Structure formats: structure tokens, C-alpha cells
Amino acid sequence: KLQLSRAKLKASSKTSALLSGFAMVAMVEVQMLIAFAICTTLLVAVHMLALMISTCILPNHWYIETAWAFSTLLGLILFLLEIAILCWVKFYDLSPPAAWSATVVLILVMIIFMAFAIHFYRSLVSHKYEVTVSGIRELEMLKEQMEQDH
Amino acid sequence: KLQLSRAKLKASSKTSALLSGFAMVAMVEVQMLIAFAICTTLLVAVHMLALMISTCILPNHWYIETAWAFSTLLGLILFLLEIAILCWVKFYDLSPPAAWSATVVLILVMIIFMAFAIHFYRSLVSHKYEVTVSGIRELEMLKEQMEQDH
Amino acid sequence: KLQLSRAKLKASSKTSALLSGFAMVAMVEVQMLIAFAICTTLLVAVHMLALMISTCILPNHWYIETAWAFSTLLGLILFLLEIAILCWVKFYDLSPPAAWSATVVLILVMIIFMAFAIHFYRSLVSHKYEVTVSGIRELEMLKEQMEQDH
Amino acid sequence: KLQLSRAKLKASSKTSALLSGFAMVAMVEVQMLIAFAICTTLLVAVHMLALMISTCILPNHWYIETAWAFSTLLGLILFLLEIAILCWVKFYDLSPPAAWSATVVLILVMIIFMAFAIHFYRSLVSHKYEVTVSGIRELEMLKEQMEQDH
Amino acid sequence: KLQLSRAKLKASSKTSALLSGFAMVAMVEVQMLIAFAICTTLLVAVHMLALMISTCILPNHWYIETAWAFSTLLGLILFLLEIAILCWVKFYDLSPPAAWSATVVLILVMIIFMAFAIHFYRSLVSHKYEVTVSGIRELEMLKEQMEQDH
Amino acid sequence: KLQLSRAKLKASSKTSALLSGFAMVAMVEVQMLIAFAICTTLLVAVHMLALMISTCILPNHWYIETAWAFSTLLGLILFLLEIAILCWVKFYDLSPPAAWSATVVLILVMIIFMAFAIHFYRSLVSHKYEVTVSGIRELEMLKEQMEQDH
Ligand SMILES: [Cl-]
Ligand SMILES: [Cl-]
């Protein structure tokens, strides 16, 4: 609980900062259509907040960890999505097919990540159930073997 | 306060620096309306102050730690606010639906930070009240248990 | 697997963030033909992936370490490839030998890495075969000599 | 001197470097009147100096240490001053009140820095006087208590 | 040999990455002739590759330390050369005397540093050989003095 | 040599790299006359050199430490010099007096640092010689107490 809270939050901050500033530089460049700025700014919302957690942890009841986790998750999500939209906007007035194919090849791999991630979430719950089952069974055999020695 | 003085203060500096300089690159691109530059400049001022904190605590009255904490809070707050104004002014005279919807999501996320922050403030009151109350009661039970053998 | 996950995961974040954002600045610059932005987006997507892994080890189930390795590997590989494509686009309308020779000399460095990589794959085969052979043999002579006193 | 030699000096280098370089990028953007370049470049001079000390402490001394301290403080003051002048010059032919009102909000915080800084300057020296006083009194009373043992 | 593998890999990666990406920013700036972009990108191949080494150390074939060494040397060499070519090309259609004279003062320093580095190659071989000499000789005198009483 | 090998050498490299890349960005700006590009590239030479020294300690040649120290010093000097020359050109086609007064105030502070640095350099020599004096006195009394008491 401690070594991961310090170690992960130490280095996550760097990521958050670079995404803040580099998505920032991404914004100020005219040299979808409207929702782009929405997505990027909501990104800045997610990373700004998760780093605000990176400030809150002086005293450091386990939900706060998961809140930090899903925060960073959404951070990486919106960063990837809106930079894809940057590959979108860069190729608009000189081509309009490149960007479509961009999201068409990559977002498929997004759904790939969602797929494998939910696979191993269910693997954690499933092995929790299996470990609980076999452990409970061993506890029962211990109950009988203990009942012999009375 | 001290182990947190090393752990948190080690990491604050990077955030302050990158937000300062990348806020610089944010400023210089013309190739509300007037208060934007003001907001950015006070923002970068606050981050400068937080850096002065990152140097000031060398020889080692704990409120100064809180000064760094909520000072930094204003740091990321003003950063998000001013990037909201960047999507605002940068895409204002070239579109008016992108930036409007931007602030429509951003004012929502400011209310998100205030909301969740007061939420977990109140949660601190909740588990502090239950655990503290049971503590006072248990201390009374220790008083009775001591009075029994008199 | 443990200490290497903390040290390697500790340092990978820097690579992912810097190459991601610096490729970002690469994007918004016009001052193959269409698929370039796609390739860059898969690159920064991959470094994003290695970063999401850099957060993922909270619940921690051992393939993920090597998956992290493949993430960063693809990160530097594709970063090289896309900067090669940057020298492609930058030296196309002002020369056609510079960029051609660019990709033609860098793909050679690809064949360099595949060559040395499969070589040291075979070297791992060398220590695996020799260690396995000597271990099995000493176990065999020890097996007969042990059977003498049985 | 030593434990603080680790704590402050480990982190100072990164901040000094990033403020130096992004002040560099700060220079090149036209897309008071003359003293701007003086203030900004003099800032970069002071922070360059702070890096010179941040390298100099090899033999591992509070005279020169305090000299570094005032160097860095004055450095950050110059940072805020010249970045205010950057927000000034970048927006000159497009408003003269926006940046003016900026300084109207900033100079308040200038006197804020001097105000809080001197408040805890003389208050800290005052608590030094209290500690010295209590020390002299307790040691003298210990002398009288020794006269009891005559 | 090992402490440099851990500590040096900790710190070298940061610099190498920054120079890789900042070489990217080096690319998109015009606002020999053709082989330049190849040279910079192949440099990024060298630092990218050395970063792949910085990933390879999960189990931690001991020459790989030396591969890290000459990899890093070639990295910084190519960096200096290609930035010299940037100082060339940025000021080419706007001057032809500045950068030429630049190389006139600097490439001499190229042979200066390669020269001194190989100088201390000669010194390292000389004093390592000298230590071996003192060992063999002292072994001879001690060998005779012990050999009399055998 | 050891505590500094971990201490100063651990952190200085980061700054050196930042100055390399950000001086690179310094070059590419057309908005003295010729020696500018020379100075910036020579800066990149010195900082590259300091990085090569910070890499050399793989076999673990102690003069190289002092070469590294003066290397980093010269690095920061040259960085300041060429960014000063950019503050020159930024105020070249729109004014020529501001930057003049800037450099005239900065070179004075350069000679300030050189001046006091050699001042208390000589004081360091003074405490070395004086420490030798007190050592001589205690050693002389040790000589009398030694051979006199035989
Ligand atoms: Cl660090
Ligand atoms: Cl560290």
C-alpha cells in the first residue's frame, strides 16, 4: 500500500505534466471539427485532477487509490484520443482520407486494450473465487482432520 | 510532516517548472478577451511561489506545508482555467461553438473538483466521527473496567 | 520480475512521455504520403500503452512483465521509424535522394537489430543448452554414484 | 548542513535548467519597451549562476551556502518579473490595459511576497531571541541550583 | 562494473531521451545539403538503440556494458555533428560565412576531444599495464625469497 | 571522489542535456552577427563533452572529474552567452540599444562571479596554508613531547 503509493505517484506526475504541456503546445496550432477542444480540455481536467491527488497525499479507506487509478486511466485515454484528432486536423486542408484511416486502424487497438483489460479484471475476480474455493476446501479437510484428534 | 516533507516536496518542483515554461509557450500564439493574460500571469506567479517553497524548507509551524498544498491547488486550478481560456480565445474568432462547449464542460469540471473535494472532506468527518466516537466510548469502558476492581 | 518491475517501470515513464509529446510537436508541422500521421499515432499510442502499464501494476499474472517489454520495444522501434518518416517528408519536395537514402539506411539498422537480436537469442540458446547439458550430466554421474551406496 | 545538502541541492538543478531553457524559447516571440531584454537576460544570468553553484558543491560552509540561497531567491523574483514583462510585450499593439491590469493583479502579489517574507523573517529571528533567552535563564538557574550544593 | 550498470542506466536515459526528442524539434525548423536529415535520424537510431539497451536489463554477455559505453559515445558525437549542421542550414540562405567559420573553430575541437579521449585510452592501457608489472615483479621477488625455504 | 561520483554526477547531466536541446531551439531563429551560431554550437560541444565524461565511468583517471567540473561550468557560461546573443537579435531589426545595456550589465556580473570566486578561492588557499600552520605547531609540540621525553 505504501511503496506503490509513493513510487507510482512519483513517476505518474511526470507523465501528467508532459501530457499537460505537450497537449498544451498541441492546442495553439492553426499553421471532428468543434468537439476537439472539448476532448482535449476534458483531458486537461482528468490529468490536472489526478495530479491534484498527487498533491493531496501527505497524510495518505482504499477508495482513494482506485480514484487515482481511474483518473490516470482516463488521462491516458483522452491523451491518445485527442492526439489521434491531431493527426486528424493536421491532414484536413491537404487530405481528408488519411485521418479517417488513422482512427480506423488505431481505435480498433483501443477496443483491443479494453478487451484484454476486462479479460484480466475477470481473471483477478475469478482466481479470487478459485483461491477462496480451494482454500475453503482445505479448511474443511482441516476441520475433519482436527475432529479426529479430539 | 517530515517524511511527507521529503516525499511530496521532492516531486512538486517538476510540476511547477513544466507548467511555468509550457505556460510560456502557451502565451505566445496569435499567428474572456482581455483578462486571459492576467489569469496566466498570476498563475505562473503562484507556481513561482511554490518553487520558492521548494527551496525554502531546508533546515526545518506546519501550516507552511498547507501553504504549499493549497497554493499548488491554485496552481493546477489556474492552469486548467487558463487553458480553458486558451481553447476560448484561440478558437473564438475562428469558431464559437468549440470554445463555448469547452467552457460548458470545464465549468462542469471545476464543479467536479469542488464537489468531490467537499465530498471527501465530509467523508473525513464521517469515519473520523465513527472511529473517534467508538474511541471515546472504549476509553469509558476502560474506566469502568478499572473501577470494577476497586 | 519484482525489483526489475519497479526500476524499469520507474524509468520507462520518462521515455514514453518525452517521445510521446515530442512526436506531438512533430505532428503539427508542415512547414509515405497519407499514412504518416497514422504511423505516428500508433507510435505515441504504444508509448501511451507502456505508460498505462506503468500505472497498471497496482493489483499486479506474469506475462504482463514481458508485455511491458514489448510495449517499450515497439516504442523506440516505431519512434525511430516515424522520425525516419519525418526525414522522409522534410526532404521530399526539396530532394528525392536524401529521404530515400534516409529510410534505406535506417531499415538497415532495423536489420542490424533483428540480426543481433536473433544472434543473442541463439546465445541464450547456447547458455541454455550448455547449462542444461552439464546439469543433466552431473546429475547422471551423481545418480549412478549415488545408486552405488543404495 | 549535510542532510540539507542532500535535500535542497538534489532538486535545485532540474528547476534551474528548465526555467533557463523555456525562458530561452520565451525570447523568440513577436507573433516597458527596451528594459525587457535586460530583465529577462539578467534573470537567465542569475539562474545560470545558481546552476554553477548547484554543480560546485563537490567537496561537501553556511557563508557560501547562504550566498547560493539569496542567489536562488533573487533568481525566482527575476523570473516572475520578466515573465510579467513577457505577457506585457507579447500583447502591446493589441491592448495596453490587459497587460496593465495584469500588473495591477501581480504587484499586489509582489508586496504579498515581501510582506509575508519579512513577517516570518522578523518573527523567526524573534523566536531565536526567545530560545536564546530561555537558554540563558535556565543555565543561570542551574548555576544557582549548583550553589545549593555548596 | 555493476554500480555503473544500475546508476548510469538510471540517469543516462533521461538525457538520451531529451536529446532524441529535442533532435526531433531540431528537424522542423527552417522558419552538406541532403544527408543531414539522415544523419540526425540515424543519431536518434543510436540513442533509441541505447535506450533499447536501457530496457534490456531486466535480468541484467558482460560486454553489453561496453556496448552501452560506445553506443553512448557515438550518440553524443553524432548529436554535436548534426547540431553543427543545424547552425549551418538555418543560416544558409541568409548567411554563408557564420556557420562555415563555426565549423572552422569547432571541428578542430572534434579532433581535440577524440584526440584527448584516445590520449587517455593510451594512459589507461599504460597504467593498467604498470599495475600488472608491479604485481608480476613483486611476485618474482617474493617468489625467490619464499623459494629459498622450499 | 566517491560521494561526488554519486552526488554531483547523478544530477548535473540532466541540466546539461536540457541546455543542449534548448540551445538547439535557440539556433533556429531569423526573426554580434556571424559568431552567434559559432557560440551556440561551441556551447553544444562543451555540454556534449560533460555528458561523455558522465558516461565514462563504466570501468571506474580522476583528473577527468576536474575536466567534468570545469566542463559543466563552461557549459553554463556558453549557454548564457548565446542566449544573450539571441536577446540581441530579437532586439536587432526593431531596436539596438536595449540588448546593449543588457549585455553591459551582464558581463559586469560575470566578472563579479569570477572576481569573488577567485577571491575566496584564495581564501581557500589561505585556510589550507593556515591549517598547515596550526598543524605544524601541534606537530612541533608533538616533536618535543616525542623525542624530548626519550
Ligand atoms: Cl527524479
Ligand atoms: Cl532519485
CSV table of N, CA and C in Angstrom, one decimal, chain D residues 16 31 35 61 70 72-74 85 105 114-115 119-120 125 127 143 147:
chain,number,residue,atom,x,y,z
D,16,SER,N,16.3,24.8,-12.1
D,16,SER,CA,17.1,25.9,-12.7
D,16,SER,C,17.2,25.6,-14.2
D,31,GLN,N,5.1,37.3,-32.5
D,31,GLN,CA,3.9,37.0,-33.3
D,31,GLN,C,2.9,36.3,-32.5
D,35,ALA,N,13.8,47.8,-21.6
D,35,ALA,CA,14.3,47.2,-20.5
D,35,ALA,C,14.0,45.7,-20.4
D,61,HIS,N,30.2,25.8,6.3
D,61,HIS,CA,30.0,26.2,4.9
D,61,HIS,C,28.7,26.9,4.7
D,70,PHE,N,20.4,33.3,-1.3
D,70,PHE,CA,19.9,34.6,-1.8
D,70,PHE,C,20.0,34.6,-3.4
D,72,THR,N,19.4,32.1,-5.4
D,72,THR,CA,18.2,31.5,-6.0
D,72,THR,C,16.9,32.3,-5.7
D,73,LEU,N,16.7,32.8,-4.5
D,73,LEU,CA,15.6,33.6,-4.2
D,73,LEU,C,15.5,34.8,-5.2
D,74,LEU,N,16.5,35.6,-5.3
D,74,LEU,CA,16.5,36.7,-6.3
D,74,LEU,C,16.3,36.2,-7.7
D,85,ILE,N,6.7,40.8,-17.8
D,85,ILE,CA,7.1,41.7,-18.9
D,85,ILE,C,6.9,41.0,-20.2
D,105,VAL,N,-2.9,43.2,-10.9
D,105,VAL,CA,-3.1,42.0,-10.1
D,105,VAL,C,-1.8,41.4,-9.5
D,114,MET,N,7.0,40.2,-0.4
D,114,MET,CA,7.8,40.9,0.5
D,114,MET,C,7.2,40.9,1.9
D,115,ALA,N,5.8,41.1,1.9
D,115,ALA,CA,5.1,41.2,3.2
D,115,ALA,C,5.2,39.9,4.0
D,119,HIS,N,7.5,39.3,7.4
D,119,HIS,CA,6.8,38.9,8.6
D,119,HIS,C,7.5,37.7,9.2
D,120,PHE,N,7.7,36.6,8.5
D,120,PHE,CA,8.3,35.5,9.1
D,120,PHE,C,9.8,35.6,9.2
D,125,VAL,N,13.4,35.4,13.6
D,125,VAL,CA,14.5,35.9,14.4
D,125,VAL,C,14.0,36.2,15.9
D,127,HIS,N,11.7,34.4,17.5
D,127,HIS,CA,11.7,33.1,18.2
D,127,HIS,C,13.1,32.6,18.5
D,143,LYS,N,23.0,27.3,37.6
D,143,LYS,CA,24.2,27.7,38.3
D,143,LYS,C,23.8,28.0,39.8
D,147,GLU,N,24.8,26.3,43.4
D,147,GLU,CA,25.1,26.9,44.6
D,147,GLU,C,24.4,26.3,45.8
